[PDB]
Amino acid sequence: MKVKILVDSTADVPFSWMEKYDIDSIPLYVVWEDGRSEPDEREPEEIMNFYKRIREAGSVPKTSQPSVEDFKKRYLKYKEEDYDVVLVLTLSSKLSGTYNSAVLASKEVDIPVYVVDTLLASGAIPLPARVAREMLENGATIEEVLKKLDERMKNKDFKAIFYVSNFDYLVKGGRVFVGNLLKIRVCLHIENGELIPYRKVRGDKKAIEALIEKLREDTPEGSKLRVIGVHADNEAGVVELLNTLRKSYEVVDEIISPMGKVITTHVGPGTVGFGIEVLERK
Ligand SMILES: CCCCCCCCCCCCCCCC(=O)O
Structure with missing residues (x-):
């Protein structure tokens, strides 16, 4: 059993953990006053450029979640790459519709997708992702992972x-x-x-x-x-x-x-x- 882990860009996942724990990042969007949009890609250069532009900017942009489609496309890509299961950890459902999108997207695909509402955001989100990986690398079932995350979160x-x-x-x-x-x-x-x-x-x-x-x-x-x-x-x-x-x-x-x-x-x-x-x- 081979499991992909997906977090959203608001997880601020450390760059090296992406390859090391096989965790992918799905971008949310940043929309400036003038209608320009950019995705939140987990790439050190892009993040640095953004820092420069937001310190400088005349305005502060707004943000939006990924669409159901953005989630579907990723899920399907994981499927065609022979993953058996996708495990999604999103930022708090109270802060964002990301969880909603991810869940809706899970109903439009064949591949079992388990979506966890972490009730967190930013650097706290990868902590449960690492832990999920480690316990999958020690032979645990998805069911066992989800039960343990819940206990520890609670x-x-x-x-x-x-x-x-x-x-x-x-x-x-x-x-x-x-x-x-x-x-x-x-x-x-x-x-x-x-x-x-x-x-x-x-x-x-x-x-x-x-x-x-x-x-x-x-x-x-x-x-x-x-x-x-x-x-x-x-x-x-x-x-x-x-x-x-x-x-x-x-x-x-x-x-x-x-x-x-x-x-x-x-x-x-x-x-x-x-x-x-x-x-x-x-
Ligand atoms: C780990 C410590 C740092 C925690 C920082 C948390 C800051 C959260 C700020 C609110 C984020 C809102 C994201 C909304 C995304 C959207 O548009 O759907």
């Missing part, structure tokens, strides 16, 4: 925690009060598939502390973690966050992933966060 073993410096992007995006102050950072997490601002602080150092204190609300210091650090063109930022994370957690694996066009569009450049997988709570 234990809140996958978390998404981040800060932005300019809240207006999220507000324009529609998925989330906070006003304006010099050096403000707004801290958010995802809880039950929704975006929740939980703290306003000033400057990176306090913001970093706030993210880690939120994690600490249900995961004691010294727990075993795996982590994807995410950033919208702010490498130094995510690097400090990860360093600070190590002072109080056993990080058994980490990698950095730049946030794609869609996530960036909503969070704004400068953003820093992490997707966290708890392996073992102390």
